[PDB]
Design a protein around this ligand. Structure first.
Ligand SMILES: Nc1ncnc2c1ncn2[C@@H]1O[C@H](COP(=O)(O)OP(=O)(O)O)[C@@H](O)[C@H]1O
Lengths: 447, 34
């Protein structure tokens, strides 16, 4: 008789690049005219094609490319297209040029955090663990007396064992306030203890208690498992520099204090490199060297640019992508010196430059269409042509930005779609950079 | 029709049938949902 269903969970939010799904190549490496949500830019998309081959080759260290071209030309969108084309597995580290100016560590070292974060590593961590209901807890003592050894009895649905354990595990059980009848998990590699709560066998022993009870664990008490960890080299560099691991008073204390950054010594990266080369030679690991993308690179300091010379040459370093949108600009921190793209010529020799074209009106229409069917809105043909008309006079971003304001006006007067009168009305409310600069230059006596 | 009518007359001398109306004078329907 009846049919029933439900769904009310909100979507992910729509965003200024969420229509980008890939580079839209064919198998020859040519760009399709419009595919994967992109249009145009073939002379750049083919080049980005060679760079996604370059990442997936793993062979190179410190190769770098610069996406250059006017505002609104899609340089960030193409860098996102590279990120989508690599999929989830390979790390892509986004960065903005003004992020180097930390107040906690030198600019020159904030770049090394990102360089070490853009190299990914995969590990088969063969952990082993004890878990169960604690049926017994009995410490053992030694000469001047103090604790020396521990008995813990554990029980699970598949058996029970009377374990013999290190007195640091007793100190750790005491810290977690573990008692008989508690269900606990112990990571034997790490001394770590997690108290889940009392076993459900005791679930009504009081009318009130603060606990939430848990079911008795399944399988044997003592067992090992092949956990697969995805981690960056930076996550090895930092965890050794201010360790929260282990069970002692010093690590337990150092976890609570303010987590200031610190200027990591090269010798520690030397140890991490020696360690991970052993994990690769044992066949435990896989390395996944990925991408560092520095958007707005043109306001790195000449300190940073002169450090990038040494970084991009390092046989460790990840592949790099830069973006810039500047002409013959003065390089920040130099005051005297003007160069292409806001980048010193000394660095500009070290990058393969990808040149980004401006759009024709007939490409504006096609981006705007693809954008409207991403915003989730319907538009009539003369209305879409009027956004293209505006796009010839103004800029690509402005013609996109008029869409949803017009869609609100459309449904505020009950229509299903944007009509030209809704775009034409919206253009009277929301000025652009060009038209505002006119009225602001006319009225300049009053501002 | 024809083959089923013969298969029915094989079964009917040794199988009974009713439809639930002998008790749905007293009982209401299943409310059935997909
Ligand atoms: N070739 C393209 N294909 C798809 N979307 C594009 C393309 N070029 C630009 N866009 C879109 O238009 C806007 C401007 O591009 P963007 O990457 O932000 O420019 P910029 O490099 O100057 O910062 C964004 O919404 C972007 O996703």
């Amino acid at each position: 008789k009846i049919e029933e269903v439900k769904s009310t969970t909100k979507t992910q939010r729509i965003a200024s690049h969420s229509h980008v799904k890939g580079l839209g190549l064919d198998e020859s490496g040519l760009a399709k005219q419009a595919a994967s949500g992109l249009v145009g830019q073939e002379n750049a998309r083919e080049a980005c094609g060679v760079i996604v081959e370059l990442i997936k080759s793993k062979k190179m260290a410190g190769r770098a490319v610069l996406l250059a071209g006017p505002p609104g030309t899609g340089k960030t969108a193409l860098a996102l297209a590279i990120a989508q084309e690599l999929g989830s597995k390979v790390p892509f580290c986004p960065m903005v040029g003004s992020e180097v100016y930390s107040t906690e560590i030198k600019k020159t070292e904030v770049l090394m955090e990102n360089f070490r974060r853009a190299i990914g590593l995969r590990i088969k961590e063969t952990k082993e663990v004890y878990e169960g209901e604690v049926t017994e807890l009995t410490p053992c003592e030694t000469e001047n007396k103090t604790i020396s050894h521990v008995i813990i009895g554990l029980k699970t649905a598949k058996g029970t064992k009377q374990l013999k354990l290190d007195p640091s595990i007793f100190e750790s059980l005491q810290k977690e306030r573990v008692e008989a009848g508690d269900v606990i998990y112990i990571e034997a590699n790490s001394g770590a203890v997690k108290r889940q709560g009392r076993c459900d066998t005791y679930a009504t022993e009081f009318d009130l208690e603060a606990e939430e009870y848990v079911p008795l664990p399944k399988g044997d008490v003592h067992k090992k498992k092949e956990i697969i960890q995805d981690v960056t080299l930076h996550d090895l560099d930092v965890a050794n520099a201010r360790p929260q691991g282990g069970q002692d008073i010093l690590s337990m204390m150092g976890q609570l204090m303010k987590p200031k950054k610190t200027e990591i010594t090269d010798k520690l990266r030397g140890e991490i490199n020696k360690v991970v080369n052993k994990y690769i030679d044992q066949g435990i690991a896989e390395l996944v060297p990925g991408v560092l993308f520095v958007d707005e690179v043109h306001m790195l300091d000449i300190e940073c640019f002169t450090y990038l010379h040494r970084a991009l040459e390092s046989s460790i370093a990840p592949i790099v992508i830069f973006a810039s949108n500047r002409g013959n600009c003065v390089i920040r921190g130099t005051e005297d010196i003007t160069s292409p793209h806001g980048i010193p010529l000394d660095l500009l020799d070290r990058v393969m430059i990808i040149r980004t074209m401006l759009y024709t009106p007939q490409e504006m229409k096609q981006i705007i269409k693809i954008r409207a069917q991403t915003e989730g809105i319907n538009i009539s043909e003369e209305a879409l042509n009027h956004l293209g008309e505006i796009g010839t006079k103004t800029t690509l971003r402005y013609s996109v930005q008029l869409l949803t304001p017009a869609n609100l006006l459309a449904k505020i007067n009950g229509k299903d779609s944007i009509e030209k009168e809704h775009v034409e009305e919206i253009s009277e409310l929301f000025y652009d950079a060009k038209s505002s600069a006119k009225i602001l230059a006319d009225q300049q006596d009053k501002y | 029709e024809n083959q089923l009518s013969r298969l029915h007359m094989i079964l009917k001398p040794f199988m009974l049938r009713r439809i639930k109306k002998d008790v749905e004078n007293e009982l209401s329907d299943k409310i059935e949902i997909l």
